[PDB]
Design a protein around this nucleic acid. Structure first.
Lengths: 555, 411
DNA sequence: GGTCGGCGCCCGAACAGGGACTG
DNA sequence: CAGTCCCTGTTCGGGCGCCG
């Protein structure tokens, strides 16, 4: 067997474990013909070699159809191999995005062939890549091969190819520094600001530099004229857009279906602004069978129809211009949902997106807005390496009020206010000092761990009082209920004294939404008030009426 | 031609496997230039995917410095080699360093590039350089010399360092010199003028052996933040309720605290804004409790076998309080920072500055870095903290969310 | 078909750590 | 006292998309 022009990556197994020894699956007669035809072709080219009984290893093998071609792809079920091989550190840290490309004079795209089959495997590792090819007869012993290149299906094949490919491009990139080469596996986006004459020369220089290592650049996959098909997009000299997305039109929707629907809606949200998957993801909660057919709710059918209405119109993105600033603007789409657009010139979106994660049982719009800014910041640094300037639907004074008074550290990068309703605001403000002339409510609540019964009420300085029996409750729900009562039976200005750190920690965080209906009722009463002062006192210390109301709600 | 000191991980543990976070453009361009240069000087060499280990990498600019500096987050590697730099080749901590009138820090990380690393240990010093928009896959390297920011580097170089410092320690015996990581702490009771000159004498004393920085500290002027009670002449119900709650919380630190006579002032269901006169038994319980807060807590002392822990509280208006302890309510030191960089505009910058000051103080006093309890959400911190870091070490931290209880540490 | 790697989303289940009360 | 229970937050396992 000849020597391959690329240096080989030494691969070991995990210490103490032997190679795989698994029996072959029974294969359909149409797949055996496709395998023997492709096996017999690859041993002629030096990519697989025969092995005898001295190889005690074996692993299953099969084949799937190629998309839009009569050719078959050979895949090996290396699940038992991959368990015992050494771990690899993948060098693909993410996926490039067209919004990060810069306008270049000339653009060229190519795709090499038999990529994994043009890179050799380590000599001492080929023995563990032994597999059997079942013949048309079950009594035939079958032909046993071992791989000489990176087997499609092994966990180290992508990792080894990406690193070997970069090593071959380094000498070219070192000689041609002004040439931009986006390397993602077998696809090479090449662009330069050189004139179109000396462009094609450097292209030819690359196709010959890659040829010296057994990497073929077929003219079938060579692309010299716009538009270019790169990473599933359409690159034009001034704009770009995704390749057409097709949503299913099922009359009867299954769970799995929603998942392909939801998956493509998230993929479309990167340039199609305003995609919502709130009501469609509400169909995937608490379901067990990927196939338990599920009827679409009224809110989900509306959400689907809106999304179909956004996909009819054509949209496109632009490229990144380093000379001008990066801008990102956010809107409050719905309750728990957010959208944003990143651009440099008005209405010329580099890309869009959405954020809708519910973090915590109690939150407000300001928290979610801060979470959204951070998600945009990280994503922007991935693609452009810088933080955009932000246009936020929150008043400057609103944000200044929040971050200065919040006990956690919180911050938003350089931003400016944009008057786009609905505006994010704080729905209520707790006073910092007790209110003069306002009735003072000493609240408490308790419950029984066994009976699940409890009381909750208050005692005031004007003699007012209430105690309410509660069934199927906890100690925490009662201390919250006691505050709800004081809010109901008080005027517009009220002072409230509790001994509940749990209740006080939730309210001071100024939430406007909650998963607990009792909190939402407390919020609704807090918005109706003009001035509210909360205070904490230690319990069981004989403080004011807090000990008097502790003895009333004891049982 | 120097012999390599053999190093091994702690038993039954693999190398670090931490993903590289996204980096800005100004950082990636700085790492490329440095790494190609360090590759050209043979300090590092490119590797491949067969190395399953990786450590995050980013760049910093020290306070009032224009040149970039490569920094590696070997916190995970240092946790996994802890038995080396503590048992075999430990460094003593001079208890007199914190008593000096002026202490100066010097980055000596460039010297570690002169000593080769153990061949079998280079596999764990692996790191990856990302690219903007993932243009190219990760450009991986590994260290072929003593890496900056690794706990095992100053321990191997300790024998070489002491021999360089002996001619200077002999001429100046009253000068205290401590080495922690890539930094060198030199403290002296000399006047500020002749102190800086002796620093330059050292600097040229290290330039002749194959090695520059400057950051001055004054540990004798480090103050602590005690728990203080208000001196009001007219007390309202709310004032007394806040006072009892704060004194009740302080009772976990000073057991001698009593709130019996003050709670008696809170018997009736009175309005919060109503003015209450202090009884004679309460005015004495208040004055006695003020004296207990002047006394030091009984039974507090540093334990070298225990890990330090630091808590930070945001007090607003650029005020930040902190406490260092090993066992709860046994605070080795308390304090308060005000007017740091980014006050009144950035809380992450202030929180980043406060951690650095606290860590620096922990190195001067005990020679350890505390594990921080940061008052910030995890996602907020991990997004911005690298933009304000100006130090060669990185402490450990965790994220807490303790609602303000009462104002124990700030009036 | 039921290969590999990367990144993203959505969900639930398992994990985990602190507070109040009881044991 | 040490044990729960109540609550809340995080981490991971598993589905889809997209790319190769």
């Amino acid at each position: 067997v000849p020597i391959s022009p690329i240096e080989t990556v030494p691969v070991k197994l995990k210490p103490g474990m032997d190679g795989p020894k698994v029996k072959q699956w029974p294969l359909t007669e149409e797949k055996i013909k496709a395998l023997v035809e492709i096996c017999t072709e690859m041993e002629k080219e030096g990519k697989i070699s025969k092995i005898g009984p001295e190889n005690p290893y074996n692993t299953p093998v099969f084949a799937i159809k190629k998309k839009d071609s009569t050719k078959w792809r050979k895949l090996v079920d290396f699940r038992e191999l991959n368990k015992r091989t050494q771990d690899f550190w993948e060098v693909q840290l993410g996926i490039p995005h067209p919004a990060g490309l810069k306008k270049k004079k000339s653009v060229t795209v190519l795709d090499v062939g038999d990529a994994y089959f043009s890179v050799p495997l380590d000599e001492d590792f080929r023995k563990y890549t032994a597999f059997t090819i079942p013949s048309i007869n079950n009594e035939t012993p079958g032909i046993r091969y071992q791989y000489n290149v990176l087997p499609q299906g092994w966990k180290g094949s992508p990792a080894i190819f990406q690193s070997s490919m970069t090593k071959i491009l380094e000498p070219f990139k070192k000689q041609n520094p002004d040439i931009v080469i986006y390397q993602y596996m077998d696809d090479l986006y090449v662009g330069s600001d050189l004139e179109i004459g000396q462009h094609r020369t450097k292209i030819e220089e690359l196709r010959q530099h890659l040829l010296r290592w057994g990497l073929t650049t077929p003219d079938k996959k060579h692309q010299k004229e716009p538009p270019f098909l790169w990473m599933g997009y359409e690159l034009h000299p001034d704009k770009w857009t995704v390749q057409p997305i097709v949503l299913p039109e099922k009359d009867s929707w299954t769970v799995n279906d929603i998942c392909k629907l939801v998956g493509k809606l998230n993929w479309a949200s990167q340039i199609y602004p305003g995609i919502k998957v709130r009501q469609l993801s509400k169909l995937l909660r608490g379901t067990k069978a990927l196939t338990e057919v599920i009827p679409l709710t009224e809110e989900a059918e509306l959400e689907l129809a809106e999304n179909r209405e956004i996909l009819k119109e054509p949209v496109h993105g632009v490229y990144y211009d380093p000379s001008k600033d990066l801008i990102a603007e956010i809107q409050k789409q719905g309750q728990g949902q957010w959208t944003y657009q990143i651009y440099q010139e008005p209405f010329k979106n580099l890309k869009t997106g959405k954020y809708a994660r519910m973090r915590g049982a109690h939150t407000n719009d300001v928290k979610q807005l801060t979470e959204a800014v951070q998600k945009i910041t990280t994503e922007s640094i991935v693609i452009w390496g810088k933080t955009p300037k932000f246009k936020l639907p929150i008043q400057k004074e609103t944000w200044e009020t929040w971050w200065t008074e919040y006990w956690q550290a919180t911050w938003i990068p350089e931003w400016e206010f944009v008057n786009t309703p609905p505006l994010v605001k704080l729905w209520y403000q707790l006073e910092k000092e007790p209110i003069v002339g306002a009735e003072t409510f000493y609240v408490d609540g308790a419950a029984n761990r066994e009976t699940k019964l409890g009381k909750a009420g208050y005692v005031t300085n004007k003699g007012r009082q209430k105690v309410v029996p509660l069934t199927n409750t906890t100690n925490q729900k009662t201390e919250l209920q006691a505050i709800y009562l004081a809010l109901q039976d008080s005027g517009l200005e009220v002072n409230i004294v509790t001994n509940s750190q749990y209740a006080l920690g939730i309210i001071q965080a100024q939430p406007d939404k909650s998963e607990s209906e009792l909190v939402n009722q407390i919020i609704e009463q807090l918005i109706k008030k003009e001035k509210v002062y909360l205070a904490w006192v230690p319990a069981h210390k004989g403080i004011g009426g807090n000990e008097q109301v502790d003895k009333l709600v004891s049982a | 031609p120097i012999e390599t000191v053999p190093v091994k991980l702690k038993p039954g543990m693999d190398g670090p496997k931490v993903k590289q976070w996204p980096l800005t453009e100004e950082k990636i361009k700085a790492l490329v230039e440095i790494c190609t240069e360090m590759e050209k000087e043979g300090k590092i060499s490119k590797i491949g995917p067969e190395n399953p280990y990786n450590t995050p990498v980013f760049a910093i600019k020290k306070k009032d410095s224009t040149k970039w500096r490569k920094l590696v987050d070997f916190r995970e590697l240092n946790k996994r080699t802890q038995d080396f730099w503590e048992v075999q080749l430990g460094i003593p901590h001079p208890a007199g360093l914190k008593k000096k009138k002026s202490v100066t820090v010097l980055d000596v990380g460039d010297a570690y590039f002169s000593v080769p690393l153990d061949e079998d240990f280079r596999k764990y010093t692996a790191f990856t350089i990302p690219s903007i928009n993932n243009e190219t896959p990760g450009i991986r390297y590994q260290y072929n010399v003593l890496p900056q920011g690794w706990k095992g580097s100053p321990a191997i170089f300790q024998s070489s360092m002491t021999k360089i410092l002996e001619p200077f320690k002999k001429q100046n015996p009253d000068i205290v010199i401590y080495q922690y990581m890539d930094d060198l702490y030199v403290g002296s009771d000399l006047e500020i003028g002749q102190h800086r000159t002796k620093i330059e004498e050292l600097r040229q004393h290290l330039l002749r052996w194959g090695l520059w920085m400057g950051y001055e500290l004054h540990p004798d002027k480090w103050t602590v933040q005690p728990i203080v009670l208000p001196e009001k002449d007219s007390w309202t119900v709310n004032d007394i309720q806040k006072l009892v709650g704060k004194l009740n919380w302080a009772s976990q630190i000073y057991p001698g605290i009593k709130v019996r006579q003050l709670s008696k002032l809170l018997r009736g269901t009175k309005a919060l804004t109503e003015v209450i006169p202090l009884t004679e038994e309460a005015e004495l319980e208040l004055a006695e409790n003020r004296e207990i807060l002047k006394e030091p807590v009984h039974g507090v002392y540093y334990d070298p076998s225990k890990d330090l822990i630091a808590e930070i509280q945001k007090q607003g208006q650029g005020q930040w309080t902190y406490q260092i302890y090993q066992e709860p309510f046994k605070n080795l030191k308390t304090g308060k920072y005000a007017r740091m960089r980014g006050a009144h505009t950035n809380d992450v910058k202030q929180l980043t500055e406060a951690v650095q000051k606290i860590t620096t103080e922990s190195i001067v006093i005990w020679g350890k870095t505390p594990k921080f309890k940061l008052p910030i959400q995890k996602e907020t911190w991990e997004t911005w903290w690298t933009e304000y870091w100006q130090a060669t070490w990185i402490p450990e931290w965790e994220f807490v969310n303790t609602p303000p209880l009462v104002k124990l540490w700030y009036q």
